[PDB]
Design an enzyme around this catalytic site. Structure first.
Site, mmCIF file in Angstrom:
data_model
loop_
_atom_site.group_PDB
_atom_site.id
_atom_site.type_symbol
_atom_site.label_atom_id
_atom_site.label_comp_id
_atom_site.label_asym_id
_atom_site.label_seq_id
_atom_site.Cartn_x
_atom_site.Cartn_y
_atom_site.Cartn_z
ATOM 1 N N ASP A 1 -2.913 5.552 1.135
ATOM 2 C CA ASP A 1 -3.744 4.480 1.668
ATOM 3 C C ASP A 1 -3.579 4.343 3.170
ATOM 4 O O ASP A 1 -4.535 3.999 3.868
ATOM 5 C CB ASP A 1 -3.395 3.162 0.995
ATOM 6 N N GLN A 2 -2.374 4.580 3.682
ATOM 7 C CA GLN A 2 -2.167 4.521 5.120
ATOM 8 C C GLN A 2 -3.004 5.573 5.830
ATOM 9 O O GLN A 2 -3.591 5.302 6.880
ATOM 10 C CB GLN A 2 -0.685 4.701 5.440
ATOM 11 N N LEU B 1 0.833 -1.188 0.000
ATOM 12 C CA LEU B 1 0.000 0.000 0.000
ATOM 13 C C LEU B 1 0.874 1.246 0.000
ATOM 14 O O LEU B 1 2.068 1.194 0.289
ATOM 15 C CB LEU B 1 -0.929 0.011 1.210
ATOM 16 N N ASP B 2 0.264 2.374 -0.340
ATOM 17 C CA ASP B 2 0.979 3.640 -0.379
ATOM 18 C C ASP B 2 0.666 4.458 0.862
ATOM 19 O O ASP B 2 -0.113 4.039 1.703
ATOM 20 C CB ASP B 2 0.620 4.413 -1.643
ATOM 21 N N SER B 3 1.282 5.621 0.983
ATOM 22 C CA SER B 3 1.133 6.409 2.186
ATOM 23 C C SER B 3 -0.172 7.190 2.163
ATOM 24 O O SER B 3 -0.581 7.727 3.215
ATOM 25 C CB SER B 3 2.336 7.332 2.349
#
Ligand SMILES: CCCCCCCCCCCCCCCCCC(=O)OC[C@H](COP(=O)([O-])OCC(O)COP(=O)([O-])OC[C@@H](COC(=O)CCCCCCCCCCCCCCCCC)OC(=O)CCCCCCCCCCCCCCCCC)OC(=O)CCCCCCCCCCCCCCCCC
Ligand SMILES: CCCCCCCCCCCCCCCCCC(=O)OC[C@H](COP(=O)(O)OCCN)OC(=O)CCCCCCCCCCCCCCCCC
Ligand SMILES: CCCCCCCCCCCCCCCCCC(=O)OC[C@H](COP(=O)(O)OCCN)OC(=O)CCCCCCCCCCCCCCCCC
Ligand SMILES: CCCCCCCCCCCCO[C@@H]1O[C@H](CO)[C@@H](O[C@H]2O[C@H](CO)[C@@H](O)[C@H](O)[C@H]2O)[C@H](O)[C@H]1O
Ligand SMILES: CCCCCCCCCCCCO[C@@H]1O[C@H](CO)[C@@H](O[C@H]2O[C@H](CO)[C@@H](O)[C@H](O)[C@H]2O)[C@H](O)[C@H]1O
Lengths: 459, 171, 170, 84, 547, 79, 104, 67
Positions: free
Chosen positions: D42-43, D38-40
């Site tokens: 998404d975080q 996941l990407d940041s």
């Protein structure tokens, strides 16, 4: 008055002859008995005053002030003994002896027939006062800062002495009963203007009047708790008591000579209440609170109507008990945190629940919540000054708003909010401290049931 | 203070929370949340940090204009309706010391366990003071971070007021 | 109990109950419940107390103050005669405060008693209150906190001079 | 009343209703970026969902650091005074 | 008169007994809150016996029992005026307080200081009954300031929260500004008359009554939060929900209206003061209703609902209809106290969530709370024959047919329409739609204390207006002849408000991107009165102090 | 101690969350949190009364009680 | 952007102590160690009415009947309304009717 | 706890609350219809409102234009 003078003197042999560990027990017990017998002074009459002898008399003005004076000695002893516990025995007895001698001068001052006898005692009270404040005060700072001693004696004590000496030559007497029948009107005259100021400036400084008040906050920040109690409760009322008496012989010149002092009091009433909002020191906050309240008393005395004199007498007693309780409440915190800063310890209601109730009651009387005698006195002065000039209701009203603001601000800052994390030595309130507060507030609230005995001779 | 990477993510989170305040309805919000996400995705792979910074600045100007006057605030968050509601119920542990012995006689098991903790705090304090001094450069700390316990038997330096902090619902 | 002439009240006229409903009047029933549970036990307690009082009968008196010469007859600076005249004036001043209080209490009792008709039916009480307040104001108003018989007399003579002058103007 | 298992279950539950995560590749120790890819952005979304799930806010400074379900579980348990 | 007067005082004396028993007389801290509720419930019964006697033959008394103090020619006594207004207000306030106390027995269950909370509510009620029954201005002042302090102590209940301490001190500030008007009246009545008694004031009936009546209007302006001294009432939502229910119904806020009703024999003959209070009320009723349109906090909305209804009461005072102003105080206390108890039921279920954007889908989840909220909302908006209709409907008819300020009348009719808009706003966002609250569902309204307390007020909100309006005696000549379009104005604008609010609510569902408006931000931010005044005024004063 | 309902129930089909997905798929986007909101649109929360329906709560039985009351009032008149 | 290895380790070590501390706030079964149906609701209510209604009204009635009402103007009634056709109890008087109304 | 909390589901209800909610909802509508039947004048109008343009000059005592 010898049934009070002689037992008060006997507190000195009692203190010096007690066992070493009984000095506080012995003096407090017997000074409370003298306070009990002081209630016999309330044998007052509708027409005449209680004239004991050629030297002393009592009327409805001095009687409540005498009872307050005699009540305060045991309270001061209870408040003083904790921080004087490390003092050596000979110095505890000297400290107690200063308080006893201060009471001796006060009861004589409030009952003297002759105004020169009043003057000598009215000044003798400073000798025990300065000794207590300086010898047992907090710091090396001089309460008698030199400028204040000079200004007061030059513009206060000395002119009063000459005026009184002059008056007795002209009238032939300074007995207050005689002055009631032989009083003559004071005509317009540059010489009479100076007699008026001479007769009044000493009491204006002691009240204190706004603009001559900077000494009072300094004295409270330096004084020990007992000093602050007597200073706030009684010693300010010496100036008020003096003005209530001496204005008898100053009419009709007071009709116009009072304007600058009314203006200073009406404006200074609002300026000092506002200062209380930005005070960082509890003792300074309460000190500026006293200046604001005593501004009402000056106005009431100067407009001299039956309602303002009744209001003035009630205000002096109510402030005496309330300001004294506020100083004791602040002192109890100080004896734990050792700082007068008001922001240092917060959220204290969490740690000291009952003491927070004393704080609330002290604040409610201070902001003049009905029907406390604090309001009864303040309302009467408001009612009278409205007649003096309807516009005054604006200034009186605004001061009522501000007084509620700094009273609850003081309660909110110190008792509510989150407590300070690093202050971990807040021990539970001692029985001594709780009893000290309850002996301030219970009589103050009980007087609401019978206010007439604090309304003075005009009642 | 923050990096560029942190400012964008803080603006993405803040933008979403205000968008949620405007939309109210979950389906409507989920529709515009993906539209907003798409806008960020459009510029995810920008490399000209001069452009990237100008993109962020215009985004923040857009946010301030489209900001919600009354955004939703979690009840217990700063500015919410429950923020600090229970502070008046949080009493620090040191107050138990001043209890009367008759008050402590009511909880004999609790107070026995409390002296075990106080003993642990004492025996640990000297070691904690050394660990900070030896690990601390000359001139004092550069940051507020604190180290872990390094050996078996040690406790992480400065732990008492974190471990014994009042519960969030003390009463 | 009190003096009916000093604190007068007109005769009470209460209309007879004239019910026109088959429902019982719950007030009349509560009245009997009150007259039985509250009044009679209270009356028994009082009657016992009043029996003890009748055994021990002692009297108190209303102090009478002989009249002494007024301030107008005192010699200037003669405190012995000024003292007694000054005390007498204060006693009269205190009595006059209570005469005004009696008249105000009549006015207030009238207003409540007359209900919505008080403006017409309390005109006699209003007039009497007006005249007494006028007379009290003439005597004692504006004397100041340091009032005395001497200042009361100075106010009167000033008023007497204005009345005498306006007679010539007439 | 929250328990350490109840917080765990609801944390994983919320993640299994995320369309970017394989519900078979998810475990308490599954790093969001290294493991799940996941990407940041998404975080940020994942943390926002946990705030909604549990009804309290995780400040951005703390939220940046929660890169697996267990760390989220530990954070929620600490703020809520859960211990068993 | 022996039974009437004895039972008139036992009601007051009874309410103070739980206060006296706090000195450890058979004290049972196990259930002090139950003891307080019972005393209120019995106080309600005994208070209903004097009320029946007054309803019967119009019997009224003054009880000047204790002579307290005489100041020359001003005798002060403890005197209770047990008249029309006292007879009818006391049973209503005791009935409402009884429900709020039983509700508090459940709402405040977990509060460690439960006993202290109930003691404060009892004192808060006692100082209100000192106010209403007071027969002289000094005793009225004791109650007047009494509620103010209890407001401070209850608004700042959670004293670790700085916002609570700020709202408690804000209530005091705005109320003591109004008290300048109270002392101005006391000073004027003492000087120009010679009394603080209402009897001697009405008997003398001054015509030059501008100054004492401007003082009373100012005193009512702050206590009942009319425009100018109004921001404190919304701020007072910092207090626990049971506090807001009492504050906004059977105690503090109506004291300002009650004071002006007491002095209607003076305001009758002062067209100037009537014009001031009409315009003062008219802006308040509209402005606060406009603010409520955009609020999202459920307690804030109801708080503005109160200011809007207090504005309408002030309008009624200003059209010379004091007895309709009183009838609205009585009826309003029923459905307004219930709405707060319904909000608290929702707030409690959703774990202290007060934002309507996080509610929704509660119509079936909370069936009894839903029923009471709908009944309460319809009563507030003047649905025919519910409790609110017997006062609001007559007030709008009387305002329409009076020789009145035209602008005040139009502002009063628009505020009536807005009442239907924010009432719909609560129902739509709290009860309709799909749930927007967290996933762990603790919705449970199955508690007899909650059900019984709301049920009694629900019955009052249905029949209280009809029962009261059929028992009170006529004191005016109600004006019943009037055109159809004036007769039905209140119902029509209420219905258009409901229609106009459905469209606004439904557009929130369209997948369209809003655009903030100047009007929206003006309503959301309360017209910026707090933001400007609460920053600028403290700044000027506090900076002035240091220098 | 507590049992979470099986997570595979929550599908956006049949709810307005499916309307959202269709509208986003036209723009080439997708909504990855759709099933996390699906519970709000299903089973007990699925169908909710309208505003007029909320007001008309209990009207059906109020009217049934009303017709009987006035009917019983008229039956007491002819008598 | 996550925890550094030391940050995780310090957090873990404070978790052990914090969770142990909270477990220690639980009360033992003996703690606190303290020192040494219609009729029921009717008795509780009957005893409440007696102590909080009957006794207060006995004291209030005694106070009003024998101490307040024996002083003038302390309890002032509003005079009862007299309507035409009434009969005065005190005198037996009979208030006449009103004129015959015109038809309406 | 006689009502268990649920996860992402409609809460458990009791019969007592549903029946009481319906009884008082139906009471409100019965009351409104019962009063509207008997007091419809309070909503529409108690008395007729005259049209002053109808009153004749004779009854208003308006003299003829030439008198
Ligand atoms: C013969 C004569 C001899 C002298 C006799 C003097 C009697 C003094 C009282 C003896 C009390 C002994 C005792 O055991 O009390 C325990 C009593 C109960 O114990 P507690 O449950 O642990 O609560 C104490 C805590 O501090 C917690 O205290 P709290 O916070 O619950 O109490 C706070 C409350 C306490 O204040 C009260 O006392 C309540 C009553 C006020 C009325 O203060 C207020 O709320 C201030 C606002 C008051 C309302 C404003 C009304 C205006 C005046 C109305 C006058 C009506 C005229 C018509 O504690 C106290 O209240 C101690 C202070 C009481 C001093 C009297 C204050 C009177 C005012
Ligand atoms: C060098 C010191 C200078 C002091 C100047 C004081 C003014 C002098 C006043 C004075 O001497 O007036 C004379 C008068 C008596 O004189 P006599 O001949 O009997 O008749 C007067 C009119 N026929 O005397 C009197 O009537 C008595 C005057 C009162 C005594 C005043 C004492 C002097 C100080 C006055 C200042 C008071 C105010 C204090 C200053 C600060 C004010 C803020
Ligand atoms: C504007 C006013 C503002 C007031 C602010 C101050 C608030 C104070 C708090 C309110 C107190 C209300 C209660 C007052 C009643 C007590 C005082 C009293 O009753 O006076 C004695 C009474 C006759 O009244 P009296 O004293 O003559 O009135 C003139 C005043 N000297 O004679 C009697 O009392 C005898 C009655 C005997 C009753 C015995 C009952 C048993 C005793 C049980 C108690 C234990
Ligand atoms: C709170 C406790 C305080 C305790 C201190 C105060 C209590 C003191 C109470 C003593 C009161 C005695 O009061 C006294 O009663 C007796 C009753 O016969 C009276 O006695 C006198 O009255 C009449 C005739 O004068 C005769 O009945 C009697 O023979 C005669 O001696 C006194 O004239 C009266 O002054
Ligand atoms: C002006 C003079 C007045 C004179 C009054 C004389 C005092 C007469 C009262 C004596 C009895 C008082 O009793 C006091 O009130 C009620 C009486 O049920 C008690 O309370 C009791 O009932 C309530 C409910 O009814 C319960 O919630 C409570 O658990 C129970 O203990 C108090 O715990 C007790 O302290």
């Amino acid at each position: 008055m010898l049934k009070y003078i002689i037992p008060t003197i006997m507190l000195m042999p009692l203190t010096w002859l007690s066992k070493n560990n009984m000095i506080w027990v012995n003096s407090t017990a017997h000074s409370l008995l003298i306070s009990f017998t002081s209630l016999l002074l309330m044998n007052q009459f509708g027409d005449n005053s209680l004239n004991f002898s050629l030297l002393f008399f009592s009327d409805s003005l001095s009687t409540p002030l005498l009872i307050l004076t005699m009540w305060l000695l045991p309270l001061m002893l209870m408040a003083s003994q904790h921080h004087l516990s490390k003092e050596n025995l000979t110095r505890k007895k000297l400290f107690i002896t200063m308080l006893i001698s201060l009471q001796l001068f006060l009861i004589m001052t409030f009952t003297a027939m002759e105004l020169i006898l009043f003057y000598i005692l009215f000044e003798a009270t400073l000798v025990p006062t300065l000794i207590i404040i300086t010898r047992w005060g907090n710091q090396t700072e001089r309460l008698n800062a030199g400028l204040y001693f000079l200004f007061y004696t030059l513009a206060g004590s000395l002119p009063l002495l000459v005026a009184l000496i002059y008056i007795q030559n002209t009238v032939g007497s300074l007995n207050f009963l005689m002055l009631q029948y032989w009083v003559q009107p004071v005509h317009n005259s540059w010489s009479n203007v100076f007699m008026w100021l001479a007769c009044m400036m000493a009491f204006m400084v002691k009240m204190p009047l706004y603009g001559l008040h900077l000494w009072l906050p300094k004295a409270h920040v330096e004084a020990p708790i007992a000093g602050s109690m007597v200073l706030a409760a009684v010693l300010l009322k010496l100036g008020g008591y003096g003005m209530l008496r001496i204005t008898l012989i100053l009419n009709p010149m007071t009709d116009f000579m009072a304007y600058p002092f009314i203006m200073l009091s009406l404006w200074g009433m609002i300026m000092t209440s506002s200062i209380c909002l930005r005070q960082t020191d509890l003792k300074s906050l309460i000190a500026y609170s006293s200046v604001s309240h005593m501004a009402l008393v000056i106005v009431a005395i100067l407009i001299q109507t039956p309602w303002s004199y009744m209001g003035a007498t009630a205000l002096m007693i109510a402030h005496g008990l309330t300001s004294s309780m506020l100083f004791c409440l602040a002192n109890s915190n100080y004896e734990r945190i050792h700082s007068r800063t008001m922001i240092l310890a917060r959220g204290l209601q969490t740690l000291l629940p009952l003491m927070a109730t004393w704080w609330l009651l002290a604040s409610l009387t201070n902001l003049a919540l009905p029907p406390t005698i604090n309001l009864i006195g303040e309302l009467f002065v408001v009612m009278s000054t409205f007649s003096w000039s309807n516009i005054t209701i604006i200034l009186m009203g605004v001061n009522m708003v501000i007084t509620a603001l700094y009273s609850l601000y003081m309660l909110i800052m110190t008792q509510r909010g989150k407590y300070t994390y690093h202050i971990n030595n807040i021990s539970p309130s001692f029985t001594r401290e709780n009893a000290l507060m309850s002996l301030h507030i219970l009589p103050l609230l009980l007087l609401t049931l019978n206010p007439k005995i604090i309304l003075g001779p005009l009642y | 203070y923050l990096t560029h990477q942190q400012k964008v993510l803080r603006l993405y989170k803040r933008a979403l929370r205000h968008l949620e305040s405007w939309c109210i309805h979950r389906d409507k919000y989920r529709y515009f949340a993906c539209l907003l996400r798409a806008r960020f995705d459009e510029h995810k792979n920008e490399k000209d940090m001069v452009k990237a910074t100008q993109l962020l600045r215009e985004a923040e100007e857009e946010f301030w204009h489209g900001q919600h006057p009354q955004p939703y605030i979690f009840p217990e968050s700063p500015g919410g309706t429950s923020y600090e509601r229970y502070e008046c119920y949080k009493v620090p542990e040191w107050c138990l010391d001043d209890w009367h012995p008759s008050e402590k006689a009511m909880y004999p098991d609790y107070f026995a366990k409390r002296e075990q903790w106080k003993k642990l705090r004492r025996e640990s304090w000297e070691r904690e003071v050394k660990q900070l001094q030896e690990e601390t450069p000359v001139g004092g700390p550069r940051t507020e971070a604190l180290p872990p316990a390094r050996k078996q038997g040690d406790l992480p330096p400065l732990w008492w007021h974190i471990v014994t902090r009042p519960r969030e619902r003390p009463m | 109990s009190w003096d009916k002439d000093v604190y007068p009240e007109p005769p009470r006229r209460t209309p007879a109950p004239s019910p026109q409903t088959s429902l019982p009047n719950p007030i009349t029933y509560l009245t009997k419940a009150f007259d039985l549970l509250v009044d009679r036990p209270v009356t028994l307690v009082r009657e016992f107390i009043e029996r003890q009082h009748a055994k021990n009968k002692y009297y108190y008196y209303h102090r009478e103050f002989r009249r002494v010469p007024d301030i107008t007859e005192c010699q200037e600076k003669d405190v012995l005669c000024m003292f007694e005249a000054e005390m007498q004036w204060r006693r009269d001043y205190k009595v006059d405060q209570e005469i005004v209080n009696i008249i105000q209490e009549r006015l207030k009792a009238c207003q409540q008693r007359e209900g919505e008709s008080h403006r017409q039916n309390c005109a006699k009480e209003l007039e009497q209150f007006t005249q007494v307040v006028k007379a009290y104001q003439d005597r004692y108003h504006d004397l100041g906190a340091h009032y005395s018989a001497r200042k009361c007399l100075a106010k009167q003579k000033q008023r007497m001079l204005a009345e005498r002058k306006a007679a010539k103007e007439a | 009343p929250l328990t350490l298992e109840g917080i765990k279950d609801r944390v994983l539950y919320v993640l299994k209703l995320y369309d970017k995560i394989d519900p078979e590749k998810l475990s308490v120790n599954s790093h969001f970026m290294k493991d799940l890819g996941l990407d940041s952005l998404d975080q940020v979304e994942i943390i926002m969902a946990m705030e909604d799930e549990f009804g309290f806010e995780i400040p951005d400074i703390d939220a940046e650091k929660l890169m697996c379900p267990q760390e989220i579980v530990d954070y929620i348990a600490d703020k809520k005074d859960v211990y068993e | 008169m022996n039974m009437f007067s004895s039972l008139s005082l036992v009601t007051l004396l009874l309410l103070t007994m739980p206060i006296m028993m706090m000195s450890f007389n058979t004290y049972k801290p196990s259930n002090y809150p139950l003891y307080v509720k019972t005393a209120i419930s019995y106080a309600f019964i005994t208070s209903m016996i004097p009320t029946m006697m007054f309803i019967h033959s119009g019997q009224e008394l003054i009880i000047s029992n204790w002579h307290w103090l005489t100041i020359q020619t001003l005798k002060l006594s403890l005197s209770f005026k047990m008249d029309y207004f006292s007879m009818m207000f006391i049973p209503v306030a005791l009935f409402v307080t009884w429900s709020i106390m039983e509700f508090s027995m459940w709402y405040m269950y977990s509060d460690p200081n439960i006993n202290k909370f109930f003691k404060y509510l009892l004192l808060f009620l006692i100082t209100m009954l000192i106010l209403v029954t007071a027969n002289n201005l000094f005793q009225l002042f004791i109650g007047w300031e009494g509620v103010g302090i209890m407001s401070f102590l209850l608004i700042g209940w959670w004293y670790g929260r700085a916002d609570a301490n700020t709202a408690a001190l804000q209530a005091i500030l705005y109320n003591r500004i109004g008290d300048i008007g109270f002392i101005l009246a006391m000073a004027w009545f003492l000087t120009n008359l010679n009394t603080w008694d209402l009897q001697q004031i009405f008997m003398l009936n001054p015509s030059d009554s501008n100054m004492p009546l401007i003082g009373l209007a100012l005193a009512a302006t702050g206590k009942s939060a009319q425009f100018g001294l109004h921001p404190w009432l919304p701020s007072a939502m910092e207090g626990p929900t049971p506090v807001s229910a009492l504050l906004h119904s059977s105690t503090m806020v109506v004291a300002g209206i009650f004071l002006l009703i007491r002095f209607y024999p003076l305001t009758e003959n002062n067209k100037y003061i009537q014009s001031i209070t009409l315009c003062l009320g008219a802006i308040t009723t509209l402005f606060t209703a406009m603010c409520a349109l955009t609020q999202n906090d459920i307690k804030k909305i109801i708080a503005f609902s109160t200011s809007s209804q207090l504005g309408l009461m002030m309008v009624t005072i200003g059209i010379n209809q004091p007895y309709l102003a009183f009838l609205h105080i009585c009826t309003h206390a029923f459905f307004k106290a219930m709405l707060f108890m319904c909000s608290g039921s929702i707030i409690h279920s959703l774990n202290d969530e007060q934002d309507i954007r996080k509610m929704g889908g509660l119509f079936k989840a909370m069936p009894f709370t839903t029923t009471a909220l709908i009944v309460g909302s319809l009563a507030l908006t003047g649905m025919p024959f519910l409790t609110g209709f017997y006062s609001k409907d007559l007030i709008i008819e009387a305002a329409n047919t009076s020789y009145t300020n035209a602008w005040a009348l139009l502002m009063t009719l628009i505020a009536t329409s807005f009442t239907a808009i924010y009432s719909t706003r609560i129902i739509f966002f709290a009860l309709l739609g799909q749930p927007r609250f967290p996933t762990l569902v603790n919705i449970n309204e199955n508690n007899p204390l909650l059900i019984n307390s709301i049920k009694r007020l629900l019955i009052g909100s249905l029949f209280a207006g009809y029962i009261i309006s059929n028992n009170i005696p006529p004191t005016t000549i109600p004006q019943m002849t009037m055109p159809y379009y004036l007769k039905t104005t209140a119902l029509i604008v209420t219905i258009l408000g409901f229609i106009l609010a459905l469209e606004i609510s439904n557009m929130t569902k369209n997948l369209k991107y809003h655009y903030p408006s100047n009007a929206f931000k003006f309503s959301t931010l309360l017209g910026y009165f707090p933001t400007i005044m609460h920053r600028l005024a403290p700044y000027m004063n506090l900076s002035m102090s240091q220098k | 101690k507590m049992e979470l309902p099986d997570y595979k129930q929550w599908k956006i089909e049949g709810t307005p969350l499916e309307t959202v997905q269709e509208k986003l798929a036209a723009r080439g986007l997708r909504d990855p949190w759709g099933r996390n909101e699906a519970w709000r649109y299903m089973g007990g929360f699925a169908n909710n009364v309208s505003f007029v329906g909320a007001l008309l709560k209990g009207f059906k039985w109020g009217f049934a009680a009303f017709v009987v009351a006035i009917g019983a009032e008229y039956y007491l008149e002819s008598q | 952007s996550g925890y550094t290895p030391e940050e995780k380790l310090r957090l873990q070590q404070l978790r052990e102590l914090r969770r142990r501390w909270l477990k220690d706030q639980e009360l033992s079964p003996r703690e606190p160690v303290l020192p040494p149906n219609v009729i029921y609701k009717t008795y509780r209510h009957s005893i409440f009415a007696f102590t909080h209604v009957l006794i207060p009204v006995w004291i209030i009635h005694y106070y009003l009947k024998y101490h307040v009402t024996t002083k003038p103007y302390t309890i002032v009634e509003k005079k009862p309304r007299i309507f035409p056709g009434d009969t005065i109890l005190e005198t037996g008087e009979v208030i006449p009717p009103m004129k015959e109304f015109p038809d309406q | 706890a006689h009502i268990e909390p649920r996860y992402r589901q409609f809460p458990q209800l009791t019969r007592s609350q549903v029946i009481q909610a319906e009884f008082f909802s139906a009471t409100m509508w019965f009351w409104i219809l019962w009063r509207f039947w008997h007091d419809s004048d309070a909503v529409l109008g108690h008395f007729p409102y005259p049209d002053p343009s109808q009153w004749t000059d004779e009854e208003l005592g308006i003299p003829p234009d030439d008198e």
